[PDB]
Ligand binder design. Sequence first.
Ligand SMILES: CCC(=O)SCCNC(=O)CCNC(=O)[C@H](O)C(C)(C)COP(=O)(O)OP(=O)(O)OC[C@H]1O[C@@H](n2cnc3c(N)ncnc32)[C@H](O)[C@@H]1OP(=O)(O)O
Ligand SMILES: CCC(=O)SCCNC(=O)CCNC(=O)[C@H](O)C(C)(C)COP(=O)(O)OP(=O)(O)OC[C@H]1O[C@@H](n2cnc3c(N)ncnc32)[C@H](O)[C@@H]1OP(=O)(O)O
Ligand SMILES: CCC(=O)SCCNC(=O)CCNC(=O)[C@H](O)C(C)(C)COP(=O)(O)OP(=O)(O)OC[C@H]1O[C@@H](n2cnc3c(N)ncnc32)[C@H](O)[C@@H]1OP(=O)(O)O
Ligand SMILES: CCC(=O)SCCNC(=O)CCNC(=O)[C@H](O)C(C)(C)COP(=O)(O)OP(=O)(O)OC[C@H]1O[C@@H](n2cnc3c(N)ncnc32)[C@H](O)[C@@H]1OP(=O)(O)O
Lengths: 384, 384, 384, 384
Amino acid sequence: RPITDVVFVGAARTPIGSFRSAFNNVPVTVLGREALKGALKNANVKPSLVQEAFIGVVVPSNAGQGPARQVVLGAGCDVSTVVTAVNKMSASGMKAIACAASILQLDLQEMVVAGGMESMSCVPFYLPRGEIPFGGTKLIDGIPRDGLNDVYNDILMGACADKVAKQFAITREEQDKYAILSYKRSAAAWKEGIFAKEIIPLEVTITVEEDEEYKKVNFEKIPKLKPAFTSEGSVTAANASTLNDGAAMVVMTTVDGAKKHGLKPLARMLAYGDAATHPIDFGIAPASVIPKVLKLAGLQIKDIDLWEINEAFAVVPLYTMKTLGLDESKVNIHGGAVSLGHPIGMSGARIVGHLVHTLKPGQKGCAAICNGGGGAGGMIIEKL
Amino acid sequence: RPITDVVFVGAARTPIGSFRSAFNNVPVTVLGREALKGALKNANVKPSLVQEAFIGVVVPSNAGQGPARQVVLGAGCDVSTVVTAVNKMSASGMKAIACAASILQLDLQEMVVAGGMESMSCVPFYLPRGEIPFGGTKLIDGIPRDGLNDVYNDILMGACADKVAKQFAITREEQDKYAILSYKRSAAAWKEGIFAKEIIPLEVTITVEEDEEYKKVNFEKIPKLKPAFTSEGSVTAANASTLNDGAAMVVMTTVDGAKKHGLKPLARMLAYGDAATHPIDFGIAPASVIPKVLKLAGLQIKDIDLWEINEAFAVVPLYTMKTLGLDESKVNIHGGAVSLGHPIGMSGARIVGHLVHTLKPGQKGCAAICNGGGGAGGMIIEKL
Amino acid sequence: RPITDVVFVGAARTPIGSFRSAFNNVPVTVLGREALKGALKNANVKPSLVQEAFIGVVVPSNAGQGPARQVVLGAGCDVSTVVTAVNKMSASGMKAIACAASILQLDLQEMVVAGGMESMSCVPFYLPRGEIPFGGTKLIDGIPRDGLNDVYNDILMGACADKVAKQFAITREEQDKYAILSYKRSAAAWKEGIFAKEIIPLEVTITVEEDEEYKKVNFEKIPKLKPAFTSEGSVTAANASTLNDGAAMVVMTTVDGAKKHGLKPLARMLAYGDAATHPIDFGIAPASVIPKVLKLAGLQIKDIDLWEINEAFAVVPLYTMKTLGLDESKVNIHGGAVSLGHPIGMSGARIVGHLVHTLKPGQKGCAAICNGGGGAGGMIIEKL
Amino acid sequence: RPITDVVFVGAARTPIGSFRSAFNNVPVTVLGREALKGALKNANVKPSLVQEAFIGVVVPSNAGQGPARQVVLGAGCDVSTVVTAVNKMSASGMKAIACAASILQLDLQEMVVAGGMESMSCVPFYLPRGEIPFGGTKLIDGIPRDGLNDVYNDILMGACADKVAKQFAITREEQDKYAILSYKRSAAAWKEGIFAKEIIPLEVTITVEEDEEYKKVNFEKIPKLKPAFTSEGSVTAANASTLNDGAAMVVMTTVDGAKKHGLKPLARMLAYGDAATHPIDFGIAPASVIPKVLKLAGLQIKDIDLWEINEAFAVVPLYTMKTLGLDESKVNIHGGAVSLGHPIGMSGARIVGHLVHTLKPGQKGCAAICNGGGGAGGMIIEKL
Ligand SMILES: CCC(=O)SCCNC(=O)CCNC(=O)[C@H](O)C(C)(C)COP(=O)(O)OP(=O)(O)OC[C@H]1O[C@@H](n2cnc3c(N)ncnc32)[C@H](O)[C@@H]1OP(=O)(O)O
Ligand SMILES: CCC(=O)SCCNC(=O)CCNC(=O)[C@H](O)C(C)(C)COP(=O)(O)OP(=O)(O)OC[C@H]1O[C@@H](n2cnc3c(N)ncnc32)[C@H](O)[C@@H]1OP(=O)(O)O
Ligand SMILES: CCC(=O)SCCNC(=O)CCNC(=O)[C@H](O)C(C)(C)COP(=O)(O)OP(=O)(O)OC[C@H]1O[C@@H](n2cnc3c(N)ncnc32)[C@H](O)[C@@H]1OP(=O)(O)O
Ligand SMILES: CCC(=O)SCCNC(=O)CCNC(=O)[C@H](O)C(C)(C)COP(=O)(O)OP(=O)(O)OC[C@H]1O[C@@H](n2cnc3c(N)ncnc32)[C@H](O)[C@@H]1OP(=O)(O)O
């Protein structure tokens, strides 16, 4: 099969909750379950048709055995469904979609689901096994420990971004200008109904139906903030992604599978892949994966109508756009992780699902998402 | 490409350590690093040639950001290497190999490594985020919580095995006879040098060069033990797999990649896949995945020379053999997880690597490994 | 020396804070320090004159080394001051005063301070030393563990009170009537300025100057509440004492010491002592200690103008009054622990200090306070 | 009464166990129970005659409600018995005896028990109440937190001793010579049967009948050790007291009570008291309390036949002896806390009970014990 036989037939996501707020105490598996129910409904695919699932999640500690399996069975899929979880840090939700696409192209399955999820609010603290040391010991926070602290450099992802920003003269002022644009774009998109196709609401009693993060902004305060990660840094709490909860899922099949069940293909796969570099330099990895997947698709930069370059920090889209010569009016046009937030296992799936829904038929979209350890995932789709 | 273009060029593993013993306080990332270095040496592949890695690991809590990445960089691979972790419970090490095979068949990479790892000794305890409730709360053990307790039935994997055993009249005595055979087969294999090709030793100061579990047996005591999981049960500490630490890796390429680099293919891929059923019934899933992968390879039961059916409990090989009509003299002939131990992320890779080394040229081997949540992975290879 | 040579020259207390409210995160040592500064100021005694201190505190875990010493040095006393802490559960603050009185009567010191303190809000959770058990373990709440759970019966103090209430036909209705009277008396006393002599305020920024608990009442809801401790119980959250934070201190000397420093004796000691019975029956112990200290003072029930019978539960003053034939109009006339709250190490000192301030000159007051394990302290003073 | 009317009629103690060794996991209340039963048996006093108890214990966290009460009821005393715990750090066991003596002299009771206890092995770790902070927090060790760290200087008691040693030229070599003498004196006393009168054994299954610490010595290694507390320090693990478990109790009455019950007085009280100085200087406090209690008894240094100056560190007896001009052949003649160990709540009672048994009729003994926060207790008795 050619890669273009792989089609997306549905996509949905939860709202993104703010840290310890809307989805406080809501396990990641609940979020994933509701996103998957939503995606299957969007696809008009009954859960019993799903043969296999790949779900990204980075720090599922204390969510119980096989949280990806919990999601799939919770969404009503049959126990015959095959399920795997993947962790590629913030690329997890995209890599899950890639793995699903690979088994479809090899005709190993016909109907598959994929996506990503994270509850950063529910990440626990750790105590090591064995003898508690005389004199006491640290209760370890799983978020920096397994999520956000670089092992090799022993500094947070944001401090890595400070390094890249200084090296490439990406100023505090440019980062704040970009952050403001992201917040304003997120608000405009919500007002225009842009997310209506892709959002499913949750009851928690309250009903959560809107992204929580993007109203949490004070434009006048942004240039006044102190550096958040290093003493002479440029990255701040306003121009960095936030800690968040959410899930995003897609339903994928082959052209034959769609015909067989009378489904409407929403988009098709053109290319996917990954690139990596030094851990501290994850911020430049999207600029390497993008040419790689363009080449796989037989396309050039001018052929992409919309870019989703995950806003890990304002630093990353800024580096990527300037280094590759991208038009900012075609990049992250409905906001991104700086203003919508960043449940790390979710975001890679969210930005792909967003392109599936928001591209006009015929248009091509490219998503690129950097990840801890120095990587980035890339993916190109064509709207149908 | 055809699946038969996918070839294994190397395989290696650490010894398996017993719980809180040989590899006590040794992070999973150290174990995986040494297994990966060993596999690359076995393949005569310089680490700089590795383009992508998939590594299985089930409960990596508190091992730091991106433990699979830590392994790959620790082993000397270039920062350009693409890395993903996978969790399919005890099938993780096998599913990783499958994912690697898929991208090789699609010509998305040429040189890939895959495997699995677990340090059960280093799994931590959890405390949830937020208010410790008045009256106190439970400090949670990550091993049952994220590893071994079934979410849906709220019983341990061994209690699930008790259920399957009683349903299908797999007696305590049959389970004990199988357990004794496994311990004896493990000791005989060690004495005969069977594992010399696949083992790499580790310095921990001690040198660990031998599987620690298989000498921890008293044959006369085995029929005297009480049930380990349920009051009227048949599963015991002796006829159940143990808790362990270890890692296993393989190096994979295409027939063209092997030619290009002057490498000797050891084995080729014939088929891989997965099946699943009700979570409590994971023990019967290997009996479903085996016919599935036989059909994918165009083979019958008689065409397989060696079976590796992971010994999660003696129950599982016994059910599988009697349901499919397998010859026990061709099943788990050098022992298995009851006597060698079961680092859950490792075992699916171990049993495939074992077939790569121990099959005679021209022979075909089938590996099947059940997993929490109701699944099993399957794989068939042919020795060259 | 006769006991009547022992005189009180000052007394002060903090407001009582509600659980995890006004004094949340304020260590017990801060509360004790401010109460002791206040008492010394009330006495017109410079801190350098204090020779010895006894301070009651029941659960000082994690308050650091020698919290009683911390209080004394924090209040400005010289390092030459001798300091001891005592724990007699809820009798601690009274027993501390008794011990101080004993060394004054023996002329072993001339100027001493005594009192009680507790921060129930700051009591920690416990994890035992050594190997954390496989499968997890309980994080133990210090409040029930070291404060409120009876060791012998393995039930809470309130469940003990249910037992005594049922045995002596002290009804739910009588307990609620008493609880209402306590809340109304507390409010009336605050409005009338009754506590103005004895209270010192604290800055925490906010200024805490009033008892927090006594406004936390809904009179209409009281008869509607469910039992709080046992399924068919009579004790409820409204008619039981609450969990609270506070400290109370007194300054004591001999008649000669007062003359020497030109101090005004506020009251003199007539008798003190203790009685005890079966742990579950602590509620009847005040009725035994009262005749004991009356006999020591050469007095009868009619000779006491005011009674302070600590309101551990409404059960306890009710039992005591009816069994001894006391006039309720002379008992706990300005409220008590049901409505003002009950920092367990404090209350014994509070009720004595209250009598020191609120008796008219010439009048005699008797304080009696039951305690976990089956005890009660008693004390009689004469206002001067 | 005169102080000389107060008589000791019995004394006993557990062996002292080494940290996490003989009495590992044995609650302090068990140790105190057995010591109290033993003392009552030594006195030939039936437990039902005991009217009141004072028991010292410094860090009873997680030992349950009212551990002193648990000891008294566990020993078979009547529920009518009045019970109080006291904490004066390492003076607790002595101050308890003082408090008992005071109420006997005032004729408030006739038959009283007193002593001290500690299980340092069972001291727990602490987690504060409320939100675990983002980023994690310290699991606190109760031993330094509530036992051994000075609050004001934020250094351990051993670091305070380093300060006193350097200020007064008490050399490493002098401290080591004293430590060696203590270990040798302890071994000689054990061999000579010195402790046979005062020890009661315990079943834990093992029988513990001997002090565990004094054989844990290597004389040749002592001068080779590194400082234990400060980089340029003189205090080492060998010349400092150790962490230990144990309990010691006495039975006390008046000359009239002894006559009434046909008991033999063993010793009489001559004086008791306390002194204090700056917290870091607790090591010089015994040199202040000794002249104080000598004056109270109308005695001089030459009138004392045996000194028990608690060996918190070798520093403390050395300072005391040279400052007061004491004859070392009369000081700690059967070893002390450096070689026998130092359960902090126990030791003040142990050294007084030891004098009760080991003094010859007509001899006078003085005990002095320093304590955290800057204090020392002192006591003088006369053997009958
Ligand atoms: C490797 C590939 C990747 O994807 S890396 C990305 C992974 N994710 C991350 O690294 C998450 C990084 N983010 C964080 O760690 C947190 O959000 C950080 C930066 C630490 C901020 O947390 P925290 O300090 O708790 O936030 P805060 O809300 O209290 O803000 C601090 C001060 O800044 C202000 N602030 C914040 N946002 C805005 C805004 N949009 N507009 C105006 N002001 C803002 C807050 O008001 C606050 O101010 P103040 O100090 O209280 O006065
Ligand atoms: C879903 C797909 C899957 O892969 S499921 C499988 C995943 N893994 C698991 O589920 C791990 C299951 N195993 C376990 O949980 C533990 O190994 C269990 C069964 C609990 C045993 O742990 P534990 O009780 O600590 O072991 P233990 O060594 O103290 O043994 C208990 C008593 O039995 C004995 N015993 C043990 N093994 C043998 C043997 N081979 N021969 C003779 N005797 C044996 C021990 O001597 C011990 O005896 P005793 O009670 O001390 O007298
Ligand atoms: C041995 C000698 C001694 O001194 S023994 C005494 C030592 N101290 C103790 O034993 C403390 C005993 N008290 C306690 O343990 C707690 O205060 C108990 C009883 C458990 C209550 O705690 P908690 O359940 O958290 O309180 P809550 O405020 O949520 O109340 C529960 C429901 O009752 C109500 N309530 C309470 N007080 C009143 C009142 N004064 N008037 C009207 N209603 C009241 C609350 O509104 C609450 O109602 P709801 O269930 O939320 O609808
Ligand atoms: C304020 C009034 C007071 O009463 S203050 C006193 C209160 N109590 C205290 O302060 C307790 C002070 N003691 C302690 O904290 C511990 O005992 C300290 C000093 C920290 C020692 O603990 P730890 O380091 O675990 O001991 P350790 O047995 O491992 O010994 C360390 C090395 O020294 C050696 N050592 C020890 N004792 C002896 C001896 N008697 N003869 C010869 N050698 C000795 C050990 O062999 C050990 O050597 P190595 O480093 O393993 O080679």
